[PDB]
Each structure stands twice: as structure tokens, then as C-alpha cells.
A and B are shown apart, each in its own frame.
Chain A
């Protein structure tokens, strides 16, 4: 059992580091590098980034945070704190009660199922087709970002982003994917240098920063025929009824005038990889040499062609009618990158609500509600599992505890008041950050995407089994 104890002591330390990193009033942590560096960041990811750990159990706490961050853009410290206390509250049950780990693991699985029931009960519905409410929802949900003054479009930019990527299928034949979204890949955002944040806009298709060769050119073709070529030849182009000539390499005056004479535009410096992206949204054939051009060079599925210059660079619009490109505008590439730091975070907020159209009672009301509902289930559950089942209830009280502790209130009395408010009162009673008072989430909204709480509990119990199932730490190469 001594080896399992050492695994428990690992997570307790990981939690003690992250414990006070939760909240708008969160206490700062001091990262001391051996070279004399000192960072006071409140980013629990950065805290976990530098924490040099000994027990591989702590390494699994880091892999746990990676798993949460990769899937759900939030949940970092919620999972670290939740998962750690789930293990910690089981400690006297392992050591003193002499409960075999298999019994403990089986009990946690049953608590997971029951916990998901409570999470559903406390949920609040929200209509994702009410764009006006989704704007008020996402704008409040992204709370505390750098683009508060630009949050109007920094919110709407993400709403119009997820508007289209929604993986929409619903039927009893194959099932409902539930609007699965891939912000990393399916969405290709094209950040445009120049403009301001509020000038940012959303397009449909692929947008390239490859500029135009001649200032006089056919500006818009509603139904073009696009020739994707890399390299007599200028005449060969026109044989296939083209309207747009795109060249991979640089372009001289001869290609400007000969193709313009026939009403064809000239585009340079477009790599075959951008020519493939053109094929994704239109369908023209990629060709190297002009003497190899064939009748398959077509400009299908091309809704709009636009050649406007923004930011000392002409852009080629490949617009068509799980893919989208946003025409984000920013005074500099660093402003464009600042947009990502705040905008893509909103994309995750919208991904969560688009994943499930349901909200969670915040201020810690979700967790204290679970701690009450599990208690009623525990006394009604027969077996040795009466002991470990209560461990989750005591662990679910840590999250609301840290909200009180970082608020400066009495960490003992305020929790007991929360217990009575959830016992006889409504499940919507939470913790106010600024006042430090017990408040109802009807008054102070803070409604959180439910899937954050669902995945947080799932990944916490999952990792708890990974930490309990280890019987010894053995050396081997």
C-alpha cells in the first residue's frame, strides 16, 4: 500500500499549487527559475508548464490538463483541483478502512454515472438559433479578455464562424453528430494585416494573400474558369475557355497584356498548395507547365472573385457558396495575433454551447448542488460503496471552497450556509466574487457551458482510476 500512498501524496501537492489559481481574485504564484527568473502568472497552464515533478503520477496530472485543454478550451484548474481532491478524499478510505483499490475504483465509476444525472438536472436551456441571445451569452461567457471594448465583433466574429462549421446531421438512420466542430483544422482563419478589430469580417471559402500582376484586370467574375499553372504558351491558355490565369512563379509584362487582351486576369506567386486550396473551394486542375494545360482547368463552385488590396498586399478571394475563412483585420500582425488570443477563445465558448445547447449554474452552484444530491443518493445506496461514494461529495466541495478562500471570506461558515441554501432552497445559489456573498445565479448570471462541467467530471474520475489502479512504481528501461 505504501506505493499507492506515494501516488496520493503526488496529487495533493499538484493541487496545493493549483488550488488558489482559480478565480477573478486568484492569488498569484511565483515561478523561480534556476537562472534567477521570476514570473507571477495566474495562468494555471503556465504554472503546470514549469512545475518540475517527481512522481509520474504528477506527470499524468499534466497529461490530464493537456487532454482537457485540447478538447474543451477551458477546464484546466477545475480538473486539476477536482481530480486531486477526488483522490485525496479517498485517502483515509485506502489507508484506514483497508478498502481494496478495485472496490474504490468500482465506486468511483458509479459516482460518475450518478454525477452526470445531477449535472443534467441543474442545467439551463439556451436557444442556439437565437443569435441575439448567443451574442449576449458568448460576450458574457468570454468575460475578462483584452478585447472588451471590441467585444461586439470579437464576439460576433466567432458566432459567424461557428454559424457555418456546424457539423449538421440529424436522423434515426446514422445518428446526430451534434454539430461537431474542429476549430483547429476545419476552420481556416485568414488574418488580414491592416484595418481595425471592428473592421474584421467573415468570408466563405479560402482567401489568399497573393497579389495581382497588373493593376488593370478583370476584377469580378461570377462564373470564372480558373487555370492553375506554374510555368505560344499565352495562346495555349485561352483554348480551354478560361477567365482567370493563376501563375505559381513570377509574371512578366507579356502575360499581363496577352491575357488581358482576351479578358483574363493574372495572378502570381500562388504555390501549388494554394492552388490545391483553390481546388477545394472551386475545383481547377493544378498544372505545372502551360503546354500541359488541358480542358479540365475549370472554375466551378466560384461564387465571388475579388482582388482588393488590404495592408500593402492584394488578396485573391476564392469565395464559394465544415469550412470557412474569416477576413480578420488588424493594424498589425500582433494585433491579428491578439485577435486569436481573444477570438479563438470565444470560438471555444461557442463550440461548447453549439456542442450542447445548455448552461450550467455558476458561482460554484453546480458543485455544491452535486454535493447535496450525492448525499441523498449515498444513504440510499447499500454496500461497502457507502464509504467511497461519500468521497466524491467531499471532493466536490473543494471547488466552491476555493471560490470562498480567494474571496477572503470565512471558509468554514460560508460553506455551511451554502449547504443549507442548496438543501432547502434552490440549486441556483452560488458565490459572488467581488462581494464575497452567497448570491443566486438568477441575479448574478455567470452561466457556464454545461459540457465544461460534464467533461471536467468525466476526465476527473477517469484520471482518478489511473492514479488508484497503480500498485507499484517499478524501474525499467
Chain B
């Protein structure tokens, strides 16, 4: 049985993710073959580092790539749903239900699940781009990464997000928020309260010039050059240095950036006269300077055409955690298209891992864009437990052997409320049966009131049963759920269809 051997393989990565997902989750130590210690809860980082052996794993891993590239969340939702969807299929296999009949069932359930998810909508983010509306989503996204640190990270992100979401109104066809709109840097030392946000670009390299600040005027004009700065060389061969700034400043420039090297006298004179000098090793970061300072790089040398100058409010050199950085930023004007997250933290693993979490929080806001992304679902398995009950109803409505598959299909959605419990340390022999009753009630009405809000208690508030998601404002993104169901349903269908693994001609 190839399908039996495949089940054995997925049991390995199922064990990996089963204990991973959740704010109470457990970290994994990952040793890079190049000599790096990686400790994270991100299963995408895990699978990137995990060598793949059994070809059936290649299906599940590439599935998580579809989720992670196309959606900034859902990594464990794919691995967790997929793991159990194939685990419960072992019962269907052993009951004698053929592979094609199991496949037909999961596809029939794909339609049932998607239609119900549309009915599970509780609220909707009205796209006010307000810090309060952002926090409603940013908090639960930061959750599952660092439990209890949401206060520090929420104030960091929601304020940083307001830097890259400018004042926009009547805008549903104008896209905003590129993933590169928020940069995160690492400064060894300090703690969470030592982190901050800069409204613009921060160079991790120490100040290279001798000038600390520009003038006090608003919208200090700035130049970027592409050609190497030296004594004017003729258009051909040749087998003035400082005169560049005499040309640049004509329009109002206090800051001169050189995308290339610097000539003899200018290295002294550009800084001597109080002008900031910059050369950037990252050429995409030069494209960032086009977005932060608004600077249009001059393709020629020593000829700052007026159209090749930008307007940047303030550029200064700043001290972060004792290690010096150079800041090219905007200030209440020519609003910066990039904001920088200043992470001060002493442990290089927690420091880097905090960045890994904030990177995902940035990605979540990309999904908070206009593509039908405001829809909210009830979190803490209220979506999952309610889906269980509604799926079993479709079983009663469905004649044939498809009834057997639908029944085992609902069982699979218990892995998410189970994982929330096993990681949190509440007895799965008590929390799970209390979840069933909390969501399974006889409502005097067609609208379940306060019974779609029943949650899973991951807090230390000792209580028999579970809590209400509105207490902490725990909502899940509908688009994350809907896309995840599509990925996992098709991914499990793929594994369930593998009848033989044949080596190609070699």
C-alpha cells in the first residue's frame, strides 16, 4: 500500500506541526548546514530548512509554499489541516473506501466548506485604516508568534503601518502597501521596551560622512548619482570633483547621495561644507531611496538635472542602542514610502525571531488590502467547531458512501481546536468536549447569539470550558481561511491520489 507508506511519512511532519501552532506553541531548534542556530515557531522557516525525503512530503511542502507566497499567513493551517485530513483518511482506507471515492468526498466537501465560511462572517473591517481597526487585526496576527508581547509589537506595527499607509480616501482601485514598505533592522542589546520605529530609512552601517545634520528647512532636496565621482572625465576614455555640489545645491539641496564612489576633494569638501555623503552597497536600497527621499538617480556624472533631484524632509545621523546608524527619512511631508522597525534586543535569536514575527505582521497588512479582505471569522476554533457541526449536517443531507467521507471530514477540523489545547496545557479530555457543547446548542432562533463567539482558553484564567473571543478581540481573516481550505483540500487530494512512485530513467 503506497497510501499506507505515505501516511507513515506525513506522520513525521504532522508531529512537527501538531506541537507548533498556537501562542502556547513549542519552538524548534534548527541547525543550518552552513552553521547557524535557528530557533523559531515559523513552520515555513522550518520547511525551508528541512530536507525532504519521501516524495509525498514534497507535495505538502510545496503546498505551504503556495500558502506563504500568495498569503502572508496560513502556514500551519495548511500543515495542520493537511496532516489530519490524511490521518482521518486512514480510517476511510481501512473501512474499504477506495481512493477515488475518498477523493470524490473531499471535493464534495470543498463546496460545502466554502459556502459555510461565507456564512460564518461575524464582523467586517470597514477599511478605515485607523489604528484601532488595524489593531483589531494586527494583535491576533502578532499573537501565535510572541504570547504576551503583543503590547510592544502592536504599538510598533500599528504605528509603523500608519507610516506606509498614507492618507487615502475614495481609494479601492488604487493599491497600497508593498511588502518592502516596512524595513526591520537588528541592533544587539536592549530589550523590548528599547525598540522603536523610524519614519524612514535607517542604514545599519555606521555614519560614513562627517556631517550629522542638514539645515532646518522643510523638504531638504537630495541628489543621487549613478556614475563614479572624480575629476571630470571626457565622454571617451581620458587615458571638478567638488564642483558637483556647486551644481547640485543650485535648486535647494542640503544632502548629496552618491550611488557610486567619491573623488579626492569631494570626500573632504562634500562633508566639509556640511553636506551628507552616502554610498549604498544595496542597489535595490537605492531604489528604496527613490521611494523614501524621493530621489531620482542621475544617470550622468556631475550634472544634477533639476528633474534628477528629490525632496526629503530630514536626513540626520542617529545613535541606536549605542551602535551608530545613518537615517534618510521624511518628516510630516513628502511622506516616506518606507518606515523602519528598530529592534533592540540582546539575544540574537530572539532579536532575529522577533523580526521573523514582525515580517509576518507586515505581510498580514498586505492581506488587509482591498481584495475582499475585511471579512472577519470567529477565532479560537469557533470557525473550526462550527464547521464541524455544519459539515456533519451536510452528511445527513448526503446519500451514498459520500456520507462516510463527510463524517470523517468533520473529524479532521478537530485538529485545530485540539492543537490550541495541547499546546496550552488544558486537558484535551475536558476542553474539547466543552467546545462541542458550547457551540452545539438549541437556539430559539436561526441566528446563534453568543454561541458563535465561544472560543478556546489559552490564558491562565482557570475556568471550566472556554472564553468569549470578544474579550481579547480575537478574529481570524476569512481570506486566510478560505485560501487555506482550498490549498489543503487539493493538497490532501494529491497525496490521496498517489498510487505508485516510479523512478525516472537514469
Contacts and interface: CB of A to CB of B under 8 A. Distances in A.
Contact present between A and B (CB < 8 A): yes
Given A382-B437, A384-B429, A384-B433, A420 B399 contact: yes
Interface stretch (A332-340, A410-418, A438-446): A410-418
A416 B429 contact: no
Contact of B401 (A98, A99, A382, A416): A416
Interface in A356-399: 382-384, 386
B95 interface: yes
Contacts of B430: 384
Given A413-B401, A416-B403, A99 B429 contact: yes
A386 B403 contact: no
A384 B427 CA distance: 11
A381 to B, nearest CB: 10
A103 B97 CA distance: 31
A97 interface: yes
B404 interface: yes
B429 A97 contact: yes
A419 B395 CA distance: 13
Contacts of B97: 412
B433 A383 contact: yes
A386 B401 contact: no
B400 interface: yes
Contacts of B96: 411-412
B433 A416 contact: no
A103 B427 CA distance: 14
B428 interface: yes
Contacts of A412: 95-97, 401
B51 to A, nearest CB: 28
B147 interface: no
A416 B437 contact: no
Contacts of A99: 429
A404 to B, nearest CB: 11
A213 B430 CA distance: 84
Contacts of B437: 382
Contacts of A382: 433, 437
Of the four ranges (under 10, 10 to 19, 20 to 34, 35 or more), the interface on chain B belongs to 10 to 19
A187 to B, nearest CB: 47
B436 interface: yes
A384 B404 CA distance: 23
Interface in A398-446: 411-413, 416, 419-420
A419 B403 CA distance: 11
Contacts of B399: 420
Contacts of A411: 96
B470 to A, nearest CB: 25
Interface string B86-109: 000000000111000000000000
Q: Which of A97, A383, A412 has the most CB of B within 10 A?
A: A412
Nearest to B403: A416
Contact of B436 (A103, A386, A413, A420): A386
A420 B97 CA distance: 17
Interface string B385-405: 000000000000001110110
Contacts of A100: 429
A416 B406 CA distance: 13
Contact of B433 (A98, A386, A413, A420): A386
A100 B429 CA distance: 9
A412 B400 CA distance: 11
A103 B437 CA distance: 19
A416 B399 CA distance: 9
A384 B400 CA distance: 30
A369 to B, nearest CB: 18
Interface string A186-204: 0000000000000000000
A413 B96 CA distance: 10
A191 B481 CA distance: 80
Nearest to B90: A92
Nearest to B98: A412
A1 B433 CA distance: 23
A98 B404 contact: no
A98 B429 contact: yes
A416 B404 contact: yes
Interface string A58-100: 0000000000000000000000000000000000000001111
Contacts of B429: 97-100, 103, 384
A100 B427 CA distance: 12
A306 B403 CA distance: 71
A352 B428 CA distance: 46
B395 to A, nearest CB: 11
B400 A416 contact: yes
B415 to A, nearest CB: 11
Interface string B352-374: 00000000000000000000000
Contacts of B428: 97-98
Contacts of A103: 429
A412 B95 CA distance: 7
Q: Which of A100, A103, A383, A419 has the most CB of B within 10 A?
A: A383
Interface string B415-459: 000000000000011100100110000000000000000000000
A413 B98 CA distance: 11
Contacts of A413: 401
Contacts of A383: 433
Nearest to B440: A379
B257 to A, nearest CB: 62
A419 B407 CA distance: 14
A103 B433 CA distance: 14
Nearest to A386: B433
Interface in A87-131: 97-100, 103
A386 B428 CA distance: 14
Contacts of A416: 400-401, 403-404
Contacts of B95: 412
Contacts of B400: 416
A416 B404 CA distance: 8
Nearest to B430: A384
B466 to A, nearest CB: 15
Q: Which of A98, A103, A416, A419 has the most CB of B within 10 A?
A: A416
A253 B96 CA distance: 82
Interface string A226-265: 0000000000000000000000000000000000000000
Q: Which of A382, A411, A419 has the most CB of B within 10 A?
A: A382
Contacts of A384: 429-430, 433
A99 B428 CA distance: 10
Contacts of A386: 433, 436
B427 to A, nearest CB: 9
A100 B430 CA distance: 12
A412 B97 CA distance: 7
A97 B399 CA distance: 30
A98 B97 CA distance: 27
Contacts of B403: 416, 419
26 contacts: A97-B428, A97-B429, A98-B429, A99-B429, A100-B429, A103-B429, A382-B433, A382-B437, A383-B433, A384-B429, A384-B430, A384-B433, A386-B433, A386-B436, A411-B96, A412-B95, A412-B96, A412-B97, A412-B401, A413-B401, A416-B400, A416-B401, A416-B403, A416-B404, A419-B403, A420-B399
Interface of A: 97-100, 103, 382-384, 386, 411-413, 416, 419-420
Given A383-B433, A412-B96, A412-B401, 7 more contacts: A97-B429, A382-B437, A384-B433, A386-B436, A411-B96, A412-B95, A412-B97
Please provide the 6 A-B residue pairs with the shortest distance between their CB atoms, ordered closest to farther: A412-B96, A384-B433, A416-B401, A384-B429, A382-B437, A411-B96
